[PDB]
Amino acid sequence: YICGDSTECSNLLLQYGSFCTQLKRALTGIAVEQDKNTQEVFAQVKQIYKTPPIKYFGGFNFSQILPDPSKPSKRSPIEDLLFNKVTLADAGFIKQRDLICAQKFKGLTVLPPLLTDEMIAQYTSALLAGTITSGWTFGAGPALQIPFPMQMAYRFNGIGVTQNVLYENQKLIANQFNSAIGKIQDS
């Protein structure tokens, strides 16, 4: 970046000495910090959980948030929509008219993240499978299975609402949830 790399200009950066190493240390610390940030956010579980092959959860339709196995990305329709709405400008790949990533020739490269998109999607899938099949039990110990209407009846007691409010309106609450998830893609 400083010198044209076809020259003895680099023989005068030794007169300053410890400055470029200080940037390389600082940017390395930033990069390791970003990988640590992704690891702290998404690696909340030590086990990769899966949904049962029969996706019936008392009338609650999770097909727009669970991963779609018919696509090679192994992502949900919402996640496949989210990656399409971000005009991503990274250059974390080996592959070499010119675009904005011709700034690599001035010494400005982009390092790829430690966790790929597929591994973050698998962490998200494990978190979703845990919170659907086991409630809050998998986050404070071993995963304990529970019916999802029974899970939602536990979650209604956490807001001061009795259990019979859910069970006498289970179809209504399932329909409201399925309508509200479907409006997320439209929004």
Partner: protein, 49 residues
């Protein structure tokens, strides 16, 4: 003797530019670290419970 002071002017320009870029990257990295700590806290307290 004259190309040296001309390139010393240019090299000090590139030194200042790189130090400025790394200072903004450290500030934005602190902001992204705060946002990621908030995201991990929201993951643990909204998703896991």
């Amino acid at each position: 003797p004259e190309a040296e002071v001309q390139i010393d002017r240019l090299i000090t320009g590139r030194l200042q530019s790189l130090q400025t870029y790394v200072t903004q990257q450290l500030i934005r990295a602190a902001e992204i670290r705060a946002s990621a700590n908030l995201a991990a806290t929201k993951m643990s307290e909204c998703v896991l419970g």
